[PDB]
């Protein structure tokens, strides 16, 4: 009677949304580009609340501007607000090179002609700044479909289309393109090390390592995306694209394959051991480079650590996971590797028709020995209501906006995905790869250990494990 079931939320309304709207994800894509300030065409909250969200996750400022739609534009249209906003950015930020122009619910409803405004601004900018090139990318992100996951993917794709349309195909680079998806600076640091150890040249899109910026003696601000116009333009010239996230950048890898014949390889997001193994095998396949001994060792260190935990503390423990779909599906596989039982997976948006075709669902259906409920179009009330109805969980894995569910239910909780504002430093700690699997497993154990102490549940057992 062994069943992995997909079902939608049974309510029309949302209580406690899992994700933000599309424009928020588009902003996140854009802030990873060097010399980029996204321009969010709509009311002011659509910008300011997202700048706050990024400050909650990263404890850093990121620059995003608004077009400040007001009442007159709601009656007569807002094109003049886009056009002014572009010029005001260009005039006041002399080094600015890229402006994704991100629509919102308001500006999608009223039908402002973004591409027409871009033609006006391109003419104005070419006349006023003859020796400057600014790339204006139209990003259509109505908030009444999809989520910040879809908006991220749409913005990446539009920026890549815009910049590669301008520069076309040149000389082969010998590099990989890599789209890790929506990951932390620590995940980017880990991937750079993997490619360096395997002697593989690669651009990671976007390179967000420097979001964790120093406080320096010279008072310099280094909190920038490192992916440049040049880096994005060179994507046309790659040997191949490695796409780690079906819902977070694969569509850009496909676009580069259609436009420039750069072959795209979509792999399972590298959460856990097998998914990391298979990612490295694909890298080896496409580059002809061997997997280095250093990665065999990191893998073995991870396995050694996880083996201290799995049958002692994890076996038969019931887990709920929520977050981005690539993360939820990848973490469910990781959980199984360490004998955890992910019985409830919650995915937070209207993309169920795609999720039903995800091959990882089938990988779960063919492996799990316990029922799995996958709730799509889920909110976080879907988790709280199921706990209130009697679902027994030993662990929750998810982002910080679910914290009160775990706190009130007295269930230990590991913070994963976005945003993780209610713990310190998690943006620096990998979750993907071998090291990431080890770090995740040790977070899980340490959360369980503290819970055993606070609840006096065999707390004496933490001596000779």
């Amino acid at each position: 009677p062994a069943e992995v079931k997909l079902s939608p939320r049974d309510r029309e309304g949302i209580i406690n949304p899992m994700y933000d709207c599309q424009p928020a994800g588009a902003q996140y894509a854009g802030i990873g580009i060097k010399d980029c300030i996204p321009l969010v065409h709509g009311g002011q909250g659509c910008t300011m609340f997202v700048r706050l969200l990024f400050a909650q996750h990263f404890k850093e400022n990121f620059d995003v501007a608004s077009t400040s739609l007001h009442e007159e534009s709601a009656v007569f249209g807002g094109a003049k607000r886009v056009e002014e906003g572009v010029l005001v950015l260009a005039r006041r930020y002399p080094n600015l090179r890229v402006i994704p122009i991100i629509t919102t619910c308001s500006t999608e409803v009223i039908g402002d002609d973004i591409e027409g405004s871009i033609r006006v601004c391109n003419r104005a900018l070419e006349a006023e700044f003859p020796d400057r090139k600014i790339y204006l990318a139209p990003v259509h992100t109505p908030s009444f479909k999809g989520s910040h996951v879809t908006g991220y993917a749409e913005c990446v794709k539009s920026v890549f289309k815009t910049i590669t349309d301008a520069h076309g195909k040149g000389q082969p680079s010998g590099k990989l393109n890599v789209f890790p998806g929506w990951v932390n600076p620590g995940d980017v640091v880990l991937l750079k090390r993997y490619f360096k150890e395997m002697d593989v040249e690669a651009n990671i899109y976007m390179d967000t390592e420097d979001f964790d910026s120093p406080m320096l003696p010279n008072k310099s601000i280094e909190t920038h995306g490192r992916t440049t116009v040049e880096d994005i333009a060179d994507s046309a010239n790659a040997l191949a694209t490695l796409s780690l996230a079906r819902y977070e950048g694969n569509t850009t890898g496909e676009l580069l394959q259609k436009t420039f014949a750069v072959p795209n390889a979509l792999v399972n997001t590298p959460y856990g051991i097998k998914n990391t193994d298979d990612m490295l095998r694909k890298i080896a396949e496409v580059t002809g480079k061997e997997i280095p001994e250093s990665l065999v060792r990191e893998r073995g260190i991870a396995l050694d650590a996880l083996a201290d935990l799995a049958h002692m503390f994890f076996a038969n423990k019931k887990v709920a996971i929520f977050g981005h779909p690539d993360l939820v599906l990848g973490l469910a596989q990781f959980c199984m590797e360490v004998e955890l039982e992910p019985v409830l997976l919650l995915i937070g948006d209207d993309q169920g028709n795609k999720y039903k075709k995800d091959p990882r669902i089938e990988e779960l259906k063919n492996t799990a020995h316990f029922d799995i409920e996958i709730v799509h179009n889920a909110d976080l009330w879907e988790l709280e209501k199921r706990i209130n109805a009697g679902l027994q969980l030993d662990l929750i894995m998810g982002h910080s906006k679910g914290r009160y569910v775990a706190i009130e239910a007295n269930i230990p909780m590991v913070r994963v995905g976005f945003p993780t504002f209610d713990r310190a430093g998690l943006y620096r700690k990998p979750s993907i790869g071998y090291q990431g699997a080890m770090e995740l497993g040790e977070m899980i154990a340490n959360a369980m250990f503290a819970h055993m102490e606070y609840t006096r549940n065999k707390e004496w057992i933490l001596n000779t494990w």
């Binding site: 309510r11 029309e12 309304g13 209580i15 406690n16 949304p17 933000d20 709207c21 928020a24 709509g42 009311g43 002011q44 909250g45 659509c46 300011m48 609340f49 997202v50 706050l52 990024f54 404890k59 400022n61 620059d63 501007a65 608004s66 400040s68 739609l69 007001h70 009442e71 709601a74 607000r81 886009v82 002014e84 906003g85 572009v86 010029l87 005001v88 005039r91 006041r92 919102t104 619910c105 308001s106 409803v109 908030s143 009444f144 989520s147 910026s213 406080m215 320096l216 003696p217 010279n218 008072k219 310099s220 601000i221 909190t223 209207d350 009330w381 910080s400 906006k401 009160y404 504002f421």
Partner: protein
């Protein structure tokens, strides 16, 4: 004079929004423009009208569903961002509700989607019988009539009460419009729709306090000591039904005249309840406020007992901080009122010199107040933007900035510490004890080893790494 900053050479209209107060000026000739349209593309700090209604005022209530009629982003964005505790387990911070507007609702209308969401919310939480419904950008644009839906829901479900607010984010110029729409609808529709028991000879409402880190609960210890019944708090640690009773109060005490003056003005017009403006931040300010309240009620001796005890408890600590904070330079980059509630109170009580102030959404009224109380040589900025903040820092070199966390994280790179001027560091900040809390955070922010360490370049052979000696009150 009015100031054209270098970063505003291509947006020179900004000069009429920035006043540098100079000796002998007639300040009436130099009042910033305020509460006007934002310039696109500036990185203004402003937010939207919906924020002002739901996040700032309505969402404070402890027992009310906050139904945001729109796509899910407006709801997500106003959840896990405020610090207004309650005495019922923080219901207000744990939950947010959306109608999850989809494309089909843009095409065909969202009224049935709202109605369904509303009944679901009441069904999921059968102990909650009060709701505020807010519009957002696209539900305003398609003309959904949320008042009509709410009317039907109340007819169909007679044990609930629903209030509605039209507050799409493009209305007005800032969050200010949301305050106004909410205040006026509440007094028009819901005041004097129930009554409560009166248990004191002395009654008041406290208008314009949102219980940031427990501010309202701290001030309530004063009212309970003095034997004053608070009919309603607008809206800190409040309830929907208490707000229906506001007409019963003898006196309206106002702190936030910006967000909440509207309903105090209408309560005076309609019910004859006098409006008393106070400052519930600031040590000596709090004493003035208590003395006014007690003079109005004729309980002066009870006021003087409370003041004496509070000064005995807290004044020595306040004065310890004043000795160490005297002459420090401060900037305040917040919504507006805290500029005029803090500039002179930190000067009087802590010796702190406020050298620059920016208001996101203040009106000309707020500028009148702050310039009346503020110093010469200080910058007064309406609707400041990020590049202006950097230029102002170079002009006035503050020792500390009271602002939101994101700006605090930006100025940290310049080795300038911050205190959260919105949600506080370690509050509450109102009242006698609260000003001591504010002073403690300011002291720990500025006299912080990490700031000194950050300045040292270990490669410089010529430099050593210092140690600083700190203190505690």
């Amino acid at each position: 004079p009015m100031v054209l900053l270098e970063c505003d050479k291509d947006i020179p209209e900004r000069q009429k929004h920035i006043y540098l107060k100079a000796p002998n000026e007639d300040t009436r000739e130099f009042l910033p423009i305020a509460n006007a349209a934002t310039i696109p593309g500036t990185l203004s700090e402003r937010g939207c009208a919906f924020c002002g209604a739901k996040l700032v005022i309505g969402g404070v209530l402890k027992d009310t569903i906050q139904m945001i009629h729109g796509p899910l982003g407006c709801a997500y964005d106003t959840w896990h961002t405020k610090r207004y505790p309650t005495d019922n387990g923080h219901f207000n911070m744990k939950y947010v509700w959306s109608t999850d507007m989809k494309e089909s609702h843009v095409v065909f209308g969202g009224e049935k989607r709202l109605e369904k969401s509303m009944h679901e919310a009441f069904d999921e939480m059968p102990d909650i019988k009060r709701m505020i419904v807010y519009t957002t950008c696209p539900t305003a644009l398609i003309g959904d009539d949320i008042k009509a839906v709410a009317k039907k829901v109340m007819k169909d479900r007679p044990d609930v009460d629903v209030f509605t607010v039209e507050c799409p984010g493009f209305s007005g110029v800032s969050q200010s419009k949301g305050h106004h729409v909410l205040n006026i609808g509440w007094i028009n529709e819901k005041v004097e729709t129930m009554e409560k028991e009166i248990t004191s000879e002395y009654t008041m409402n406290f208008i314009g306090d949102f219980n940031i880190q427990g501010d309202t609960q701290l001030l309530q210890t004063y009212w309970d000591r003095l034997g004053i019944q608070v009919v309603a708090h607008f809206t800190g640690n409040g309830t929907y039904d208490d707000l229906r009773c506001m007409h019963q109060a003898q006196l309206n005490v106002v702190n936030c005249a910006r967000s909440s003056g509207y309903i105090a003005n209408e309560l005076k017009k309609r019910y004859g309840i006098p409006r008393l403006d106070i400052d519930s931040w600031g040590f000596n300010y709090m004493a003035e406020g208590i003395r006014k309240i007690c003079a109005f009620f004729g309980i002066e001796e009870k006021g003087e007992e409370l003041i004496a005890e509070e000064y005995a408890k807290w004044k020595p600590k306040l004065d310890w901080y004043k000795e160490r904070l005297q002459g420090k330079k401060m900037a305040i980059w917040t919504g507006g009122p805290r500029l005029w509630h803090w500039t002179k109170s930190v000067e009087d009580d802590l010796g702190v010199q406020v050298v620059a102030m920016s208001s996101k959404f203040g009106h000309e009224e707020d500028f009148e107040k702050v310039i009346a109380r503020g110093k010469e040589g200080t910058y007064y900025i309406d609707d400041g933007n990020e590049l202006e903040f950097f230029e102002i820092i170079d002009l006035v070199k503050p020792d500390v900035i009271f602002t939101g966390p994101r700006v605090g994280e930006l100025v940290k790179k310049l080795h300038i510490p911050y205190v959260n001027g919105h949600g506080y560091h370690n509050g509450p900040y109102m009242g006698f004890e609260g000003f001591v809390n504010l002073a403690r955070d300011m002291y720990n922010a500025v006299h912080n080893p990490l700031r000194h360490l950050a300045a040292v370049d270990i490669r410089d052979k010529s430099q050593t790494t210092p140690v600083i000696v700190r203190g505690a009150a």
